[PDB]
């Protein structure tokens, strides 16, 4: 089964990685529902920086021969969605 | 003299990664003085703006012989020189 799990204060770096957000925290989740298996759809909660330092959503994809590159410490909140499982090992 | 890698705005990620504070820029350079394995680190000068603290230094390894991933959004300047890049392939 493809179970959705969320872990924060820890991030795992895959391969294909971009960064897109503007507003509406929940809304950017659907950015990977366009056709995006989104193997990791993760967030990085911020605001205490420069007035308005709002959401920047983290999207990366790996589980091939390249497993994960671990980022320790100040990670936001990374969640596994659903369709990633079927794309897990392409 | 070897493979001095200095990227601007764009972050080239291979395999290993860890973050140290950028409190005194020389500090993270000293990571290489404890163990010459750091091939290139990502620097972000996030201080002169709002945060009176400092930024951070992304110590990473494998530039060339790794799956070279090019990502953006959190990049500043990834810079190092060294001679250890000899073992970058193996």
| Closest residue in A to B68 (Cα–Cα) | A15
Domain extents in chain A: 1-90
**In this structure, how many other beta carbons lie within 10 angstroms of the beta carbon of residue A85?**
15
Tell me how far apart the alpha carbons of residues A79 and A77 are, in angstroms, rounded to a whole number: 7
Rounded to a whole number of angstroms, the distance from the CA of A58 to the nearest CA of chain B is 10
Tell me how far apart the alpha carbons of residues A20 and A31 are, in angstroms, rounded to a whole number: 9
| Closest residue in A to B48 (Cα–Cα) | A50
Q: Is A18 on the interface with B (CB under 8 A)?
A: yes
Q: Method of determination?
A: NMR
Label residue A4 left, alpha or beta by phi (over 0 means left) and psi (-120 to 50 means alpha).
beta
Give the CATH class of A1-90: alpha beta
């Amino acid at each position: 089964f493809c179970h959705s799990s969320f872990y924060h204060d820890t991030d795992f770096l895959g391969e294909e990685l971009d960064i897109v957000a503007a507003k509406s925290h929940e809304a950017c989740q659907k950015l990977c529902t366009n056709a995006v298996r989104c193997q990791f759809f993760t967030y990085t909660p911020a605001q205490a920086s420069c007035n308005e330092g709002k959401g920047k959503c983290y999207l990366k994809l790996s589980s091939n021969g390249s497993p994960t590159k671990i980022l320790h410490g100040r990670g936001g909140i990374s969640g596994y969605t659903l369709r990633l499982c079927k794309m897990d090992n392409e």
